Design a protein around this ligand. Structure first.
Ligand SMILES: [K+]
Ligand SMILES: [K+]
Ligand SMILES: [K+]
Ligand SMILES: [Mg+2]
Ligand SMILES: [Mg+2]
Ligand SMILES: [Mg+2]
Ligand SMILES: [Mg+2]
Ligand SMILES: [Mg+2]
Ligand SMILES: [Mg+2]
Ligand SMILES: [Mg+2]
Ligand SMILES: [Mg+2]
Ligand SMILES: [Mg+2]
Ligand SMILES: [Mg+2]
Ligand SMILES: [Mg+2]
Ligand SMILES: [Mg+2]
Ligand SMILES: [Mg+2]
Ligand SMILES: [Mg+2]
Ligand SMILES: [Mg+2]
Ligand SMILES: [Mg+2]
Ligand SMILES: [Mg+2]
Ligand SMILES: [Mg+2]
Ligand SMILES: [Mg+2]
Ligand SMILES: [Mg+2]
Ligand SMILES: [Mg+2]
Ligand SMILES: [Mg+2]
Ligand SMILES: [Mg+2]
Ligand SMILES: [Mg+2]
Ligand SMILES: [Mg+2]
Ligand SMILES: [Mg+2]
Ligand SMILES: [Mg+2]
Ligand code: NA
Ligand code: NA
Ligand code: NA
Ligand code: NA
Ligand code: NA
Ligand code: NA
Ligand code: NA
Ligand code: NA
Lengths: 134, 194, 72, 59, 110
RNA sequence: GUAGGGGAGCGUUCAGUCCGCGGAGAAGCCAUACCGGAAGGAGUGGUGGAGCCGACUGAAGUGCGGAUGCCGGCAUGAGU
RNA sequence: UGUUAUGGCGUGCCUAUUGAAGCAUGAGCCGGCGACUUAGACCUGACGUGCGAGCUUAAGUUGAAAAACGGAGGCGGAGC
RNA sequence: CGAGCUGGAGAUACGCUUUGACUCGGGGAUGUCCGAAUGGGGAAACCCACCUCGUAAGAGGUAUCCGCAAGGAUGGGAACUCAGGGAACUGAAACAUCUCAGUACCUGAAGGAGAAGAAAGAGAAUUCGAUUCCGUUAGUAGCGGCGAGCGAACCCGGAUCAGCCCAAUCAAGCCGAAGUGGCUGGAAAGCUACACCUCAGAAGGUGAGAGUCCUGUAGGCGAACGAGAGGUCGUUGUUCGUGAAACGAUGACUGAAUCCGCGCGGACCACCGCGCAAGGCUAAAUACUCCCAGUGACCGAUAGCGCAUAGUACCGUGAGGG
């Protein structure tokens, strides 16, 4: 038992020791020692000198709801805004968006916060109604 | 598939974890467990600042046959330690699903040999201890192999004090290390069980 | 020291370049970054008996108009 | 370094450098034709590695 | 350097109780208690006899010789015996003096 | 085959577990012509006078010829 | 096995270097001490394991010869 | 508490002890001299006074800063807390900002904790609702020779959760189950054959390894009685470096209103929304550790504190080192 209990045969491998190797002189030869401030960033080595700026904003990010999630499987247990948390679309703090990806005819009803044109001309086209906040 | 010794009779409940017990799986577990036990203890003046010593010494160039600055450095008999033991933790949180699976697989390991259960211990009757042993002698519990009792009820524990025979485990505080530590196992109560 | 509350204790002093220009210049370079302090003035005033202590100009102007726990 | 955030090197699907053209744009310009309207895309298969390592996490 | 502190610095006997030697030398041999030293756990009993020699440099007529003296022991005894063997006296009681307690095992005669 | 990368292992201390050894005597030290592909391991004897191998697993203050290295002891220069 | 005569052969060690027995560096000898560590739910990759289109908690609470509770939150899930 | 005691002290002599010696707790009484040192002086542990009470001895008082008085304070503390004042190396592979960093040091004040605190707030939901700390938000928003690099807060979870008052069981200690023979041995607690206890199989000692020999542990008992405004100018804080730069704070000049009122909501204005200063106090959750107990994949003396005691010997005029 507790003595015949082995390992995963390939889980934890021995650590790398630098003391003793009958030919080990760790690190480079010269210019590498008790100095850990070389870095790989900076501002002259492939970084800066580049000509950008743009403008940072970041406003509202929506939650993609793949059409195949509503349709295809499931048996329409109503979307709403609470029972949909169990449809593997739990995020909170942000609105919900409906997007069209799955192509299949089925009459379902959708209650999100915003939706795409195509999605609206995809759900109603097969039976249903997408309801948006007033 | 283990039948209760005193009282009812079932044992067909509780599904057994596949495959037929896996060593490594218990490995990961015990290791984690003993790891959460190790205490943070490291009496070492790794720091050269932590030991008692000045900062200046002999002249850089001149004296000859020297070249040192303080007397607290690792190269000095009496100084600090280079990369010594610091007081740390080493307590992580092995994924729950895996801890649940652990003891399941442990009991599993005990369901293919030394498995034993019991409902109600009216046979105990106060501390006494003596009649407890006498009892064991009627349950294959010679006192040759190590055993673990995981049952509630104070009065029953109170009557259970020895080293090689059995072992007391309050409020079903099961633990893969414990069960796998002792040979036989005595679940007794069906609290956590079924 | 003054009379009312604590005084002195002063801050630093900055010095820039290219003052003004054609509606916003390039930028402002700081060059100074040194640190100084501020002193005060006293006066002969008494309270209850014969005193002199200290009297800031502010508290002087304020005291002359209204005797807030004291008198000229 | 926050600079990397507004610098052409965004995180794409695959994970490579989004660059433009740093040939000549503002100051100093007034020769050639479409060399100015050449604000396309850039990609390097030798400095991606050592570049995304200051923005890969904050994708 | 510790010594005798391992016990609570109390003796389980007095300086006039007959005791026997359990383990060591003079097994079964009994005698009376002369010196009882609680701290150092030392006990003098007319049993363990050791022929020592007192060195007297210049103390008015030296005349060196081997005198007869006793050697102390630790808890290497058994205080109080009645059935002719050692015992673990505990049971306390009283006869006419309620201020003091007594001892015994399965008998009562200590 | 140098820098360098990759792989399999030896050894030491602590820890859990198991099998145990010890006054007819542990560890340590000392000798040796035996064993293993290496790190190493073992038998016997001598010394010693209390504790300690092997296996498996976990963790490191883990392996020294060098640094005009640190401490300590003892040499050479000389019976000068 | 030990020791020894004779024959053949034979340019200390390390370091640093295009190049060392070097008349380049270090070092009297032995013993002991003495150098790639630790931390940050950090970042990235290999391997292994538990779950799996979902996967996990942190502070803490209650219990500690044992551990469970705790889903504020983070990562998947759509990009431009 | 129940026989011993007569300090580390190895020795000798004289002695104290059932009228309970020592030892262990807990209150008192004596405490020269110096030291905040405070009668005065003073190169500390010395020198010199006066007054009062008196049988000489002797005792008592005699400093300064607040008060009618009582009383309290100038002192000392390893670390921790707040405050006044405030670096540089270093980094930017140079260096002026900025970082280092309000770090180190200095100083003042106070406690067993402090700070802070009962909204002229945060914030954008017409919301939460003293403060602090922890998790998270997040390394986002944002700052920056826009370089090096620096870096919040709201929501939510959790530790703990109170707002009331002015001006107009742990320390002594006792009790406490259960073994004899034979054998190797210098000596067994080991081997061996039987037996017992077990609300006690923690541990230490005892000639060696130890349930039943000792001290103890589980458990039980346990005292006399001892604790529990705005603005201008110069600048600064917060993520905020003069930038569109609000707001708080402050030095110098000035100087508003109060009910169809005042401040604020990142110049400014209207709308809208939140909130009412210029008065104070206030457990807990938090920090640290001289001291004590327990514990350790902590050391076992070239380690571990510097010290298996010593800040000693030793070095220095000294701080200081050791
Ligand atoms: K290697
Ligand atoms: K070498
Ligand atoms: K993987
Ligand atoms: Mg080198
Ligand atoms: Mg080179
Ligand atoms: Mg360095
Ligand atoms: Mg950097
Ligand atoms: Mg360059
Ligand atoms: Mg020399
Ligand atoms: Mg040391
Ligand atoms: Mg264009
Ligand atoms: Mg011995
Ligand atoms: Mg080392
Ligand atoms: Mg050497
Ligand atoms: Mg030389
Ligand atoms: Mg030497
Ligand atoms: Mg001569
Ligand atoms: Mg000569
Ligand atoms: Mg000569
Ligand atoms: Mg050669
Ligand atoms: Mg030569
Ligand atoms: Mg040479
Ligand atoms: Mg040279
Ligand atoms: Mg005086
Ligand atoms: Mg300041
Ligand atoms: Mg600037
Ligand atoms: Mg500033
Ligand atoms: Mg203002
Ligand atoms: Mg030492
Ligand atoms: Mg030594
Ligand atoms: Na993008
Ligand atoms: Na431009
Ligand atoms: Na050998
Ligand atoms: Na006593
Ligand atoms: Na620099
Ligand atoms: Na201070
Ligand atoms: Na201003
Ligand atoms: Na030694």
């Amino acid at each position: 038992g507790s003595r015949k209990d082995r390992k995963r045969v390939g889980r934890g491998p021995g650590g790398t020791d630098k003391t003793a190797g009958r030919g080990h002189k760790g690190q480079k030869s010269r210019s590498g020692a008790g100095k850990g401030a070389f870095f790989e960033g900076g501002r002259s080595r492939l970084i800066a000198r580049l000509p950008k700026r743009g403008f940072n904003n970041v406003g509202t990010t929506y939650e993609v709801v793949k059409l195949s999630q509503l349709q295809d499987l499931e048996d329409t247990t109503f979307d709403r805004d609470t029972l949909e948390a169990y449809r593997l679309v739990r995020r909170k703090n942000r609105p919900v968006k409906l997007l069209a990806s799955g192509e299949i005819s089925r009459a379902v009803t959708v209650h999100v916060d915003a939706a795409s044109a195509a999605a609206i001309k995809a759900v109603e086209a097969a039976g249903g109604r997408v309801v948006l906040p007033e | 598939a283990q039948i209760n010794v005193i009282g009812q009779n079932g044992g067909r409940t509780i599904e057994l974890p596949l495959p037929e017990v896996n060593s490594g799986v218990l490995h990961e577990v015990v290791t984690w467990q003993l790891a959460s036990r190790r205490r943070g203890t490291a009496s070492t003046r790794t720091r050269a600042q932590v030991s008692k010593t000045g900062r200046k010494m002999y002249g850089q160039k001149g004296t000859g046959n020297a070249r040192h600055g303080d007397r607290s450095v690792p190269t000095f008999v009496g100084g600090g330690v280079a990369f010594g033991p610091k007081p740390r933790s080493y307590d992580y949180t092995l994924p729950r699903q895996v801890r649940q699976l652990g003891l399941a697989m442990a009991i599993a390991s005990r369901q293919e040999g030394g498995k034993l259960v019991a409902v109600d211990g009216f046979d105990i009757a106060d501390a006494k201890t003596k009649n407890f042993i006498s009892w064991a002698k009627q349950n294959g519990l010679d006192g040759t192999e190590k055993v673990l009792l995981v049952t509630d009820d104070e009065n029953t524990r109170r009557a259970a004090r020895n080293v090689s025979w059995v072992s007391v485990l309050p409020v079903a505080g099961v633990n893969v290390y414990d069960i796998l530590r002792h040979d036989r196992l005595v679940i007794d109560a069906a609290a956590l069980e079924i | 020291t003054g009379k009312k509350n604590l005084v002195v204790n002063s801050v630093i002093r900055r010095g820039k370049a290219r003052a003004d220009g054609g509606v916003g210049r390039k930028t402002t370079g700081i060059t100074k970054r040194v640190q100084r302090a501020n002193l005060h003035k006293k006066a002969i005033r008494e309270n209850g008996q014969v005193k002199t202590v200290w009297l800031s100009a502010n508290a002087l102007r304020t005291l002359s108009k209204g005797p807030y726990k004291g008198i000229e | 370094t926050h600079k990397m955030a507004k610098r052409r090197i965004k995180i794409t699907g695959t994970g490579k450098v989004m660059a433009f053209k740093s040939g000549k744009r503002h100051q100093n310009t007034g020769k050639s034709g479409d060399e100015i309207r050449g604000k396309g895309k850039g990609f390097v298969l030798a400095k991606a590695e050592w570049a995304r390592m200051k923005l890969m996490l904050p994708r | 350097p510790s010594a005798g502190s391992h016990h609570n610095d109390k003796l389980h006997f007095k300086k006039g109780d007959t005791v026997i030697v359990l383990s060591g030398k003079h097994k079964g041999q009994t005698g009376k208690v002369l010196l009882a030293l609680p701290r150092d756990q030392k006990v003098v009993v007319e049993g363990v006899n050791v022929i020592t020699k007192n060195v007297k440099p210049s103390m008015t007529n030296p005349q060196g010789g081997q005198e007869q003296r006793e050697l102390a022991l630790h808890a290497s005894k058994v205080a109080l015996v009645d059935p002719e063997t050692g015992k673990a006296t505990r049971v306390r009681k009283q006869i006419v003096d309620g201020k003091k307690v007594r001892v015994a095992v399965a008998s009562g005669k200590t």
